[PDB]
mmCIF file of C-alpha atoms and ligand atoms in Angstrom:
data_model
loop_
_atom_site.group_PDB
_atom_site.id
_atom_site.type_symbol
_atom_site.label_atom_id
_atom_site.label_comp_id
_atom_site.label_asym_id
_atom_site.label_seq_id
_atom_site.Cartn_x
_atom_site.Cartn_y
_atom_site.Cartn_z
ATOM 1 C CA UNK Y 1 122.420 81.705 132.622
ATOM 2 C CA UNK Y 2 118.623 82.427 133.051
ATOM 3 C CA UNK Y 3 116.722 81.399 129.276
ATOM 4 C CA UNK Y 4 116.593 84.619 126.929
ATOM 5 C CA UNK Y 5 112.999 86.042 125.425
ATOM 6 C CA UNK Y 6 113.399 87.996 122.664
ATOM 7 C CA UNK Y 7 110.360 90.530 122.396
ATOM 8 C CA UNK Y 8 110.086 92.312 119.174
ATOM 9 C CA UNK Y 9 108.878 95.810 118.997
ATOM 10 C CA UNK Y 10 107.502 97.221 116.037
ATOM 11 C CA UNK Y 11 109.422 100.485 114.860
ATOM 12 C CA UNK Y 12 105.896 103.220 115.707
ATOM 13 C CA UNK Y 13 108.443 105.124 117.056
ATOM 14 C CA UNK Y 14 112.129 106.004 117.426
ATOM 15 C CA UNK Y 15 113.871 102.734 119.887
ATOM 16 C CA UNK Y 16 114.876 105.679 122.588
ATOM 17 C CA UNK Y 17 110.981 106.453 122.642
ATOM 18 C CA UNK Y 18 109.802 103.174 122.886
ATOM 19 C CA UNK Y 19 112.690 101.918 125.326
ATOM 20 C CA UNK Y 20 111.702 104.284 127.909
ATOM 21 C CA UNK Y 21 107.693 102.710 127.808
ATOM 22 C CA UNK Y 22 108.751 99.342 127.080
ATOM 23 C CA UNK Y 23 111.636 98.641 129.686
ATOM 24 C CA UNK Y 24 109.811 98.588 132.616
ATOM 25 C CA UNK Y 25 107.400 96.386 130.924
ATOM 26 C CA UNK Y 26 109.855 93.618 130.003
ATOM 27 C CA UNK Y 27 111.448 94.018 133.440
ATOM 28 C CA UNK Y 28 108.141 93.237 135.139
ATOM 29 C CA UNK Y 29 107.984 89.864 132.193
ATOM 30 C CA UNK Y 30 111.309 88.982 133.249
ATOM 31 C CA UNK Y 31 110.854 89.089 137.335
ATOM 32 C CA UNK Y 32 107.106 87.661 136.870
ATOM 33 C CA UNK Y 33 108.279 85.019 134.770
ATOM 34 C CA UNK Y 34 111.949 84.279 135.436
ATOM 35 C CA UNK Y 35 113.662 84.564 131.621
ATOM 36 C CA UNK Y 36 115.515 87.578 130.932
ATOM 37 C CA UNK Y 37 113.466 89.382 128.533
ATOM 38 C CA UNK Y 38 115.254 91.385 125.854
ATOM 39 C CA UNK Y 39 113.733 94.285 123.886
ATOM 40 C CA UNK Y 40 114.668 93.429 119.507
ATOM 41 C CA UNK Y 41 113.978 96.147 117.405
ATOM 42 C CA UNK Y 42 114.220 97.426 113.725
ATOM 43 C CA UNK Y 43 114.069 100.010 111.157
ATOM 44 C CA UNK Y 44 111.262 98.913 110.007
ATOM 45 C CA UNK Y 45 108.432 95.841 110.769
ATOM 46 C CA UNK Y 46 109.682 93.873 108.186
ATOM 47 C CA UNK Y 47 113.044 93.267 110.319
ATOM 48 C CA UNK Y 48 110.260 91.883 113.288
ATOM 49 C CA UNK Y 49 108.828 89.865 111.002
ATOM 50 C CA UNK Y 50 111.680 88.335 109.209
ATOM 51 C CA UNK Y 51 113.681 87.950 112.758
ATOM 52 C CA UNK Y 52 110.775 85.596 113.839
ATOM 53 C CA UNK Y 53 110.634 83.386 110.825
ATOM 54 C CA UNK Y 54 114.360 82.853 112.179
ATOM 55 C CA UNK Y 55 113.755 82.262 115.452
ATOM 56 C CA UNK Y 56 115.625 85.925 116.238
ATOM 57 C CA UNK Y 57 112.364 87.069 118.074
ATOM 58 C CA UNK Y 58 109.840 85.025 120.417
ATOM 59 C CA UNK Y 59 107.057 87.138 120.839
ATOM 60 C CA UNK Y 60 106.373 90.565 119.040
ATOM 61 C CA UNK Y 61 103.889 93.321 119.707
ATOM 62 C CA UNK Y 62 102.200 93.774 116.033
ATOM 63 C CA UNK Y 63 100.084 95.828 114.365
ATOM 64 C CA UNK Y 64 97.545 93.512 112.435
ATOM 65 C CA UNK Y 65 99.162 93.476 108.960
ATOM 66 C CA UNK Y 66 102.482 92.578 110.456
ATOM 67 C CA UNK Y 67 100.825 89.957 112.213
ATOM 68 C CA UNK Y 68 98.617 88.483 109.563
ATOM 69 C CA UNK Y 69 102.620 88.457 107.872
ATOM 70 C CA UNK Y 70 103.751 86.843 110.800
ATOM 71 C CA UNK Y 71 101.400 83.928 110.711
ATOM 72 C CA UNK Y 72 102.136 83.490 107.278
ATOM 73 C CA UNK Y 73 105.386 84.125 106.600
ATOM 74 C CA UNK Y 74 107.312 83.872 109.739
ATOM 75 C CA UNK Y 75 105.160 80.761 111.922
ATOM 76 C CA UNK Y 76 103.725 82.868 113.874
ATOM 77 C CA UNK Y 77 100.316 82.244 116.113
ATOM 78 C CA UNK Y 78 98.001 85.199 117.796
ATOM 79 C CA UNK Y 79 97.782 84.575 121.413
ATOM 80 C CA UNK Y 80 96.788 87.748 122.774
ATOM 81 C CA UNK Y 81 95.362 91.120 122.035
ATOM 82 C CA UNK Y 82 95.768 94.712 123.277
ATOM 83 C CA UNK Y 83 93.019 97.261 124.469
ATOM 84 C CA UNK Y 84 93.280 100.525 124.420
ATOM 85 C CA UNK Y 85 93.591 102.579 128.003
ATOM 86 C CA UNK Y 86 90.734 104.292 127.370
ATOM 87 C CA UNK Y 87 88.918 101.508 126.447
ATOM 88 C CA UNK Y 88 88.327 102.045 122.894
ATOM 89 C CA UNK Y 89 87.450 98.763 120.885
ATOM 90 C CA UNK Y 90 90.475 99.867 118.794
ATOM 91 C CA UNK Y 91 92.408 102.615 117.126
ATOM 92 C CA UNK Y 92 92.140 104.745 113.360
ATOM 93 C CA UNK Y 93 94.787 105.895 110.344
ATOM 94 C CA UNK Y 94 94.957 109.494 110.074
ATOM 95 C CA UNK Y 95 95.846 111.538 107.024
ATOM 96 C CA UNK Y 96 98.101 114.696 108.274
ATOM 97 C CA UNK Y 97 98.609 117.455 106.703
ATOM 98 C CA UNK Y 98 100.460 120.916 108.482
ATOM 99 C CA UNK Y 99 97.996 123.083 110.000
ATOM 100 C CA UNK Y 100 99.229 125.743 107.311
ATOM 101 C CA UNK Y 101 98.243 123.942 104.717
ATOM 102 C CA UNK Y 102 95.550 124.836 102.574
ATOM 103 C CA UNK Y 103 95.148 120.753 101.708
ATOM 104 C CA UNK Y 104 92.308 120.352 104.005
ATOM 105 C CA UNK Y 105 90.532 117.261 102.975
ATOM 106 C CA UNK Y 106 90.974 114.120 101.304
ATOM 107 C CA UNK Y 107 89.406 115.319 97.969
ATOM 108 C CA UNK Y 108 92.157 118.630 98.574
ATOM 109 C CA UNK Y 109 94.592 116.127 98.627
ATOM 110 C CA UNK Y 110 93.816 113.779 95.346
ATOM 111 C CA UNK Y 111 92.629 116.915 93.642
ATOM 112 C CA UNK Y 112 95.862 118.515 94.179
ATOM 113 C CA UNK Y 113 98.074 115.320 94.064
ATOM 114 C CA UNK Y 114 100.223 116.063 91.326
ATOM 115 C CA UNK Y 115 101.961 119.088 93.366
ATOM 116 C CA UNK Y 116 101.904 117.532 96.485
ATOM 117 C CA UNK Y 117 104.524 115.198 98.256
ATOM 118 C CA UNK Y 118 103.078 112.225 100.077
ATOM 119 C CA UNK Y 119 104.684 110.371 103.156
ATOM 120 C CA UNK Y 120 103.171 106.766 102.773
ATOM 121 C CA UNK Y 121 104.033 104.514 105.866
ATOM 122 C CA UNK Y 122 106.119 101.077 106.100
ATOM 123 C CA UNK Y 123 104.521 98.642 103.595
ATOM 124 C CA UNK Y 124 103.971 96.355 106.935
ATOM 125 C CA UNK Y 125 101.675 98.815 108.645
ATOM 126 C CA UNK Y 126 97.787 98.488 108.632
ATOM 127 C CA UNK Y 127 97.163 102.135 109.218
ATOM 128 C CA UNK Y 128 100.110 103.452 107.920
ATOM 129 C CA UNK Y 129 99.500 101.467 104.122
ATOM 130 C CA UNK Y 130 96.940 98.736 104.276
ATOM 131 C CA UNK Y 131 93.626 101.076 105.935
ATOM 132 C CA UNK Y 132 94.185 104.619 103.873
ATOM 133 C CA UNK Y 133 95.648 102.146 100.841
ATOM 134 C CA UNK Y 134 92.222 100.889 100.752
ATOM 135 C CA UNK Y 135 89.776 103.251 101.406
ATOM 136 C CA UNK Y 136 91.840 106.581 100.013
ATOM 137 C CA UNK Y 137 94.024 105.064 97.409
ATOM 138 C CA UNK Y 138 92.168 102.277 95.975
ATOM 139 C CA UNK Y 139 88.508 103.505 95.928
ATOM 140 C CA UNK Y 140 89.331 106.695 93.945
ATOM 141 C CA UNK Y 141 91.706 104.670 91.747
ATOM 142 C CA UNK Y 142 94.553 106.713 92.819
ATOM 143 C CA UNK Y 143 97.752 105.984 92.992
ATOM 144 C CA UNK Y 144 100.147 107.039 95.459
ATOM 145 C CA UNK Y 145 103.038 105.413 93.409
ATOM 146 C CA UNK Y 146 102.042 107.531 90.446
ATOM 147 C CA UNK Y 147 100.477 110.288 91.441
ATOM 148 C CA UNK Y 148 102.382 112.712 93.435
ATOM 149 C CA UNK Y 149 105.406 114.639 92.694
ATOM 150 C CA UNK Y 150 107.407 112.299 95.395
ATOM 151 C CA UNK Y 151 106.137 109.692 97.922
ATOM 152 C CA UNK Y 152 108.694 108.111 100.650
ATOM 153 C CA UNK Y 153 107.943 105.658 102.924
ATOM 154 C CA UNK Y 154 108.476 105.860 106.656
ATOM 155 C CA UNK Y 155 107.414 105.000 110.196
ATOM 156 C CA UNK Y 156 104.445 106.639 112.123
ATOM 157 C CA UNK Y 157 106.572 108.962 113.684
ATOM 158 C CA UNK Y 158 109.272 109.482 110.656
ATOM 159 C CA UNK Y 159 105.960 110.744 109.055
ATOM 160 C CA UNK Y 160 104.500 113.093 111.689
ATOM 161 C CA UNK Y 161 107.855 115.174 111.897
ATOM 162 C CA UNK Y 162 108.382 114.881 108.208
ATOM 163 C CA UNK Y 163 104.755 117.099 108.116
ATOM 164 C CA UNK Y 164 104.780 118.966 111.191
ATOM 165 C CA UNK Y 165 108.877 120.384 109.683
ATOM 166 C CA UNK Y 166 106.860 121.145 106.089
ATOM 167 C CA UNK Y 167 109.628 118.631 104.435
ATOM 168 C CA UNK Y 168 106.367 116.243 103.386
ATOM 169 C CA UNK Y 169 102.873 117.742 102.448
ATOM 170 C CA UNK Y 170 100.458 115.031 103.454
ATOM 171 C CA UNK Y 171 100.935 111.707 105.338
ATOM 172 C CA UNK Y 172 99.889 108.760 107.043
ATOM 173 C CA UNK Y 173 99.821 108.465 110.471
ATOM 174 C CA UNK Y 174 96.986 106.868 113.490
ATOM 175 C CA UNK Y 175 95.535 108.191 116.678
ATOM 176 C CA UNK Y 176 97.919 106.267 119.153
ATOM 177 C CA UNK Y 177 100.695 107.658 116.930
ATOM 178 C CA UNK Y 178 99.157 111.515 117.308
ATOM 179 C CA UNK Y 179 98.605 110.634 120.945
ATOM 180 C CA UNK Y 180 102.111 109.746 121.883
ATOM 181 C CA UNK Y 181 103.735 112.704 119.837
ATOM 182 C CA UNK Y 182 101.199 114.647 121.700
ATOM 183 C CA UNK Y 183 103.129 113.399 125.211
ATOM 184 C CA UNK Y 184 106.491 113.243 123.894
ATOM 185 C CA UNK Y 185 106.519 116.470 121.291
ATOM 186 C CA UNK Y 186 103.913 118.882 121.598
ATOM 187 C CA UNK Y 187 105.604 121.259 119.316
ATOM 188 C CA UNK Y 188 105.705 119.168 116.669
ATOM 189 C CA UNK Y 189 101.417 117.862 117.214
ATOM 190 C CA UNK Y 190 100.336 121.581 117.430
ATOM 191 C CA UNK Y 191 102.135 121.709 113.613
ATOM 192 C CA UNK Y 192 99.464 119.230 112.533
ATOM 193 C CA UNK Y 193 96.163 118.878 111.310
ATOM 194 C CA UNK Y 194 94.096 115.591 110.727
ATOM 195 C CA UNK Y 195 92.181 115.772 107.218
ATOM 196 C CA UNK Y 196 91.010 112.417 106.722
ATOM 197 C CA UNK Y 197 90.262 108.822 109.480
ATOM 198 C CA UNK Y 198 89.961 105.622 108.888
ATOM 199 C CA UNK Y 199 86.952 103.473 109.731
ATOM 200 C CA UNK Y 200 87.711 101.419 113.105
ATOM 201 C CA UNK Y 201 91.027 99.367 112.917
ATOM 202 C CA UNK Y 202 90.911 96.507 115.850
ATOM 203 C CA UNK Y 203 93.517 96.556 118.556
ATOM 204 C CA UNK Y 204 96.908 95.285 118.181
ATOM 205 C CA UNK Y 205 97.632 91.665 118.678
ATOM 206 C CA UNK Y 206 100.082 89.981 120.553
ATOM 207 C CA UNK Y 207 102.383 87.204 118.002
ATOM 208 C CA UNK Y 208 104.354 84.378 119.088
ATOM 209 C CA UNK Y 209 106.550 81.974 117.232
ATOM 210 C CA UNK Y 210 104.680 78.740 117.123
ATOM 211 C CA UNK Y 211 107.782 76.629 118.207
ATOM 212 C CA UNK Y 212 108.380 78.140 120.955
ATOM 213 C CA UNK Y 213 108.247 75.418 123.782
ATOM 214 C CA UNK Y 214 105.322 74.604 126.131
ATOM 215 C CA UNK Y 215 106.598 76.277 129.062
ATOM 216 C CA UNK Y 216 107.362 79.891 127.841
ATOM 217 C CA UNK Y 217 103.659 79.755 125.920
ATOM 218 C CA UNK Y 218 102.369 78.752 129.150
ATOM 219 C CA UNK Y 219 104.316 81.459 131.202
ATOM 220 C CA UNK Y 220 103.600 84.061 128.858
ATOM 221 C CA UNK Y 221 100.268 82.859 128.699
ATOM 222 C CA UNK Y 222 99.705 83.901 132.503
ATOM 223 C CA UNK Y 223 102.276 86.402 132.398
ATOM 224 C CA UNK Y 224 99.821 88.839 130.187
ATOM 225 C CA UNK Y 225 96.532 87.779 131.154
ATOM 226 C CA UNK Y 226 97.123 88.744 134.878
ATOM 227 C CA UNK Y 227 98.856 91.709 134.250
ATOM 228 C CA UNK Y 228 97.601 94.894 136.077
ATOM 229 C CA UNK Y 229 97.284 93.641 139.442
ATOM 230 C CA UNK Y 230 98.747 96.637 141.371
ATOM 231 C CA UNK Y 231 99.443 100.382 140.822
ATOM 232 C CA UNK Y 232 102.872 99.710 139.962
ATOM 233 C CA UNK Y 233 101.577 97.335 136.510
ATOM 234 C CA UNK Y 234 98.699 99.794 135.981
ATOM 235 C CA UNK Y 235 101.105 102.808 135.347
ATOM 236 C CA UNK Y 236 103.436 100.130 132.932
ATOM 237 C CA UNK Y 237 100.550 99.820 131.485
ATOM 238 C CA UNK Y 238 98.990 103.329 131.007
ATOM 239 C CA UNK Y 239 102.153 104.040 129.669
ATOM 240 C CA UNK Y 240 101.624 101.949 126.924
ATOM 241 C CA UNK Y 241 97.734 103.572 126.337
ATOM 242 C CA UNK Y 242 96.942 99.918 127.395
ATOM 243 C CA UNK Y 243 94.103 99.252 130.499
ATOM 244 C CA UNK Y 244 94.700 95.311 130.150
ATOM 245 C CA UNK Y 245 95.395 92.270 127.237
ATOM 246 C CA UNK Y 246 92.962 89.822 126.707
ATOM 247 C CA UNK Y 247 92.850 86.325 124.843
ATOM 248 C CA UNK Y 248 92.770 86.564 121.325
ATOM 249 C CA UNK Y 249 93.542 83.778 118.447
ATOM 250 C CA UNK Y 250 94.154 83.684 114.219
ATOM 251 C CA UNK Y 251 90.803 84.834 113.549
ATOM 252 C CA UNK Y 252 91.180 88.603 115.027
ATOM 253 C CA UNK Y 253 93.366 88.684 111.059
ATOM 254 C CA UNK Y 254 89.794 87.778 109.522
ATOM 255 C CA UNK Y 255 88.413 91.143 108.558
ATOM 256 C CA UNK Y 256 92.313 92.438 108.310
ATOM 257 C CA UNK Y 257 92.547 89.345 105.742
ATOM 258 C CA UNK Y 258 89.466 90.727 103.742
ATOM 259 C CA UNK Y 259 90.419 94.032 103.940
ATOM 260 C CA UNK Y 260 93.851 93.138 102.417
ATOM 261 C CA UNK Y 261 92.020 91.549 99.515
ATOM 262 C CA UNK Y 262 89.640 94.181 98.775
ATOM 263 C CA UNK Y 263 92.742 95.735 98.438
ATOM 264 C CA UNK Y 264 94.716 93.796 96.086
ATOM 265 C CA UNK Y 265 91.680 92.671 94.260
ATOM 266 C CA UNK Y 266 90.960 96.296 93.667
ATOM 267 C CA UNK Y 267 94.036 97.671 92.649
ATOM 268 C CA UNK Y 268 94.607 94.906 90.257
ATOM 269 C CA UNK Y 269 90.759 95.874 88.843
ATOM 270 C CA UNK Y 270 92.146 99.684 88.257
ATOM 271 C CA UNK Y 271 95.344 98.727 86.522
ATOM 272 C CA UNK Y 272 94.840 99.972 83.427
ATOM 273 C CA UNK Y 273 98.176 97.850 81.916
ATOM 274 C CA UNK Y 274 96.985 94.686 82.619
ATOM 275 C CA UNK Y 275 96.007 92.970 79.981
ATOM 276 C CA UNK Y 276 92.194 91.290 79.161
ATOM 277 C CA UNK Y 277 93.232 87.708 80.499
ATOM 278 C CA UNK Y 278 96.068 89.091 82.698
ATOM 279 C CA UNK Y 279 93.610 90.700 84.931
ATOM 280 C CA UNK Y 280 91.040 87.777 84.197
ATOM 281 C CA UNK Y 281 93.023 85.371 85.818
ATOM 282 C CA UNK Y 282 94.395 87.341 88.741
ATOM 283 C CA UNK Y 283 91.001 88.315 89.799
ATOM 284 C CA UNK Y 284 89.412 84.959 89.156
ATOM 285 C CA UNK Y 285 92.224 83.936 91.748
ATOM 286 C CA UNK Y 286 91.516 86.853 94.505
ATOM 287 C CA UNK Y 287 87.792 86.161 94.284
ATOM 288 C CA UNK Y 288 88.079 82.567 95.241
ATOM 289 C CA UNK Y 289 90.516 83.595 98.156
ATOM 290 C CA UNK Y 290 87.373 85.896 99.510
ATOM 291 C CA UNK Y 291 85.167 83.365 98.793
ATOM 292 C CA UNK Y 292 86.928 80.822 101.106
ATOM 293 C CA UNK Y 293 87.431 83.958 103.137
ATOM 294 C CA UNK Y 294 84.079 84.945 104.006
ATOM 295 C CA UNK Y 295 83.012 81.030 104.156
ATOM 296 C CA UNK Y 296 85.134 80.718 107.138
ATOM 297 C CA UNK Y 297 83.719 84.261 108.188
ATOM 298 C CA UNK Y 298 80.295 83.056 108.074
ATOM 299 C CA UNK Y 299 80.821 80.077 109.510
ATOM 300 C CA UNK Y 300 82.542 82.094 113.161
ATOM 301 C CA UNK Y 301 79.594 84.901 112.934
ATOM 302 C CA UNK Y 302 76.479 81.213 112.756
ATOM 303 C CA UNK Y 303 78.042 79.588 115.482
ATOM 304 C CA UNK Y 304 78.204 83.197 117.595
ATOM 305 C CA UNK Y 305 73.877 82.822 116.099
ATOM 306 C CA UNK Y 306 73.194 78.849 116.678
HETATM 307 CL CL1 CL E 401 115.807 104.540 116.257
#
């Protein structure tokens, strides 16, 4: 009758994949810190997300969007963050495309878009939606709702086969993604091409619920921070294209935060049905969210200067 963690894994990745990374991980958790730790996952990050705001999961590994969710939807709190095993400051969205197609570059792809079929990712996902929904999508007033013949909406790795089997001409995907398919299905990465990356997306945080009690915060707390000790953690680890967590807090969402807004400020500036005072308001609204936004921005970057 040992207390029960349940640690929510984001759906990258079928759960047989994942399991086989992530159980000797939470095995380690649960010897190290005495609860049994239990592995929740979904069909998509929205089912994380919505099992914390009901106390169904504890503590999730996130990818920022579905954090910056977390915190506000689902009461979550940022106590941790992920780095990369090769010690990359983070990780980037990909656009894929099969190596046989003749798509071969973003402008390919939005020249083209009316004959193509587009795998967008889970609405949850920073580089599956939020990153390329920004930058691709948003900045050439494009829209992937509209503009191609079909669009579906899938995980990382949904997306990768869905390309790499010629059922979906061009999709979203993101390095760790393209490195794990790599390991685990090399016949389906040598079907795909990259033909478009993101600008640097930071690495993923670590989420719990913020009423969990003291003493699992506090466990946890240790738990991760002195994690890769010995050759046995390091391989967990490396496994997971992690070399170590460190501390993180709220304010690792600030640039995510902006980034979302860009977004959402910008799509609502290239909606052409929107009427005059429609549009007036809702971007009179988004610009005083960036405003407080970048205050509180500025404020972290001049006490960093004074
Ligand atoms: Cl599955």
């Amino acid at each position: 009758d040992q207390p029960v963690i349940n640690f929510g894994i984001i759906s990258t990745e079928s759960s047989q994949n994942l399991k086989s990374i992530w159980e000797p991980f939470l095995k380690d958790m649960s010897q190290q810190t005495g609860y049994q730790v239990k592995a929740f996952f979904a069909p998509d990050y929205a089912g994380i997300i919505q099992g914390m705001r009901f106390d169904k999961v504890d503590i999730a590994w996130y990818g920022n969007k579905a954090a910056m969710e977390a915190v506000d939807r689902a009461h979550g709190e940022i106590f941790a963050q992920t780095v990369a095993a090769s010690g990359a400051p983070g990780y980037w969205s990909l656009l894929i495309a099969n190596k046989d197609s003749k798509i071969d570059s973003l402008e390919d792809m939005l020249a083209n878009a009316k004959s193509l079929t587009f795998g967008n990712g889970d609405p949850n996902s920073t580089s599956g939606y939020l990153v390329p929904g920004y930058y691709v999508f948003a900045k050439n007033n494009v829209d992937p709702v509209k503009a191609f013949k079909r669009t579906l909406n899938s995980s990382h790795e949904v997306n990768a086969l869905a390309v790499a089997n010629k059922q979906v001409d061009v999709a979203t995907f993101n390095t760790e993604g393209m490195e794990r398919l790599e390991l685990t299905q090399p016949e389906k990465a040598r079907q795909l091409k990259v033909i478009w990356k993101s600008p640097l997306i930071p690495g993923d945080p670590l989420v719990w619920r913020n009423n969990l009690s003291d003493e699992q915060k506090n466990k946890l707390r240790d738990f991760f921070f002195k994690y890769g000790a010995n050759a046995e953690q390091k391989k967990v680890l490396a496994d997971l294209q992690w070399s170590k967590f460190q501390a993180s807090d709220d304010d690792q969402l600030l640039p995510i935060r902006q980034l979302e807004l860009f977004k959402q400020r910008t799509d609502v500036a290239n909606n052409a049905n929107l009427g005059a005072e429609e549009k007036a308001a809702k971007l009179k609204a988004l610009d005083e969210e960036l405003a407080k936004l970048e205050k509180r921005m500025a404020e972290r970057e001049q006490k960093t200067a004074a």
